[PDB]
Amino acid sequence: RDVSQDLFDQLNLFEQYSAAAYCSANNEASAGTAISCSAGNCPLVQQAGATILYSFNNIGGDVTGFLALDSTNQLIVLSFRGSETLENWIADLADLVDASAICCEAHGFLSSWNSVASTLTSKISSAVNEHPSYKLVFTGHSLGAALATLGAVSLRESGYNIDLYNYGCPRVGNTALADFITTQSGGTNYRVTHSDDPVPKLPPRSFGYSQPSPEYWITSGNNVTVQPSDIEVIEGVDSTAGNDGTPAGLDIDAHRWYFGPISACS
């Protein structure tokens, strides 16, 4: 209802970034190589001239993705990849840890993050000292999506202006953490959901988990081209509308589809 064309194109661009995080060619690639996607999984960034600044594969959980520069759109993107074995990853997905360093407490996710955190923050600082006029964006899909969200909420403690673009992100922490992510003056947050996606539903909210807002929920089905008319914004934090309002189930093909097959390049 309330979404523009250029913002829709930005959402598609960052979902294609998250999809390029799946390409094994873009992972562990030598710095300086351009971003390429098998089966045109990301032609909007592949034709945007994004250069790989760093590519990481298996560090810490399975932290995999790339930090890249985009001078056509003038921004530095840190995109995390989900899980190579996503169906084995959704099975053991519900422990909670004490994450009062941001507080209120988060979920494995923060484990892998704080494992890669010092090195990735050093590289991010170098990249943003390179181009101080570029926007810092963290993004990802599924597991990586979580690694993106926390990955931002732990770097806004410093004077970092970070925009977040998660696709099919699970729940990371309590309701206080959702409120903190919702109310933060260090950049805007774009949480994207799609249909009967069981990944934003898990871990269950009964067990203390909660997801922040706004929720950008697309009404399009699986394996179907999407239009901005199908995208609705949801304002209530931890709202039973959109994805969380969809009934229980395991529509994994709905999690496979986010503006295109986001997980099909590994």
Author numbering: 31 to 90, 92 to 124, 126 to 135, 138 to 141, 143 to 301
Question: What does the literature reporting this entry say, word for word?
Answer:
Lipases (triacylglycerol acylhydrolases, E.C. 3.1.1.3) are water-soluble enzymes that can catalyze oil hydrolysis, esterification, and transesterification. For the first time, we have cloned and heterologously expressed the lipase from Rasamsonia emersonii (ReLip). The functional analysis revealed that ReLip has an optimum acidic pH profile and was active on a wide range of substrates from short to long carbon length chains. Furthermore, ReLip is highly thermo-tolerant under extreme conditions such as in the presence of methanol.
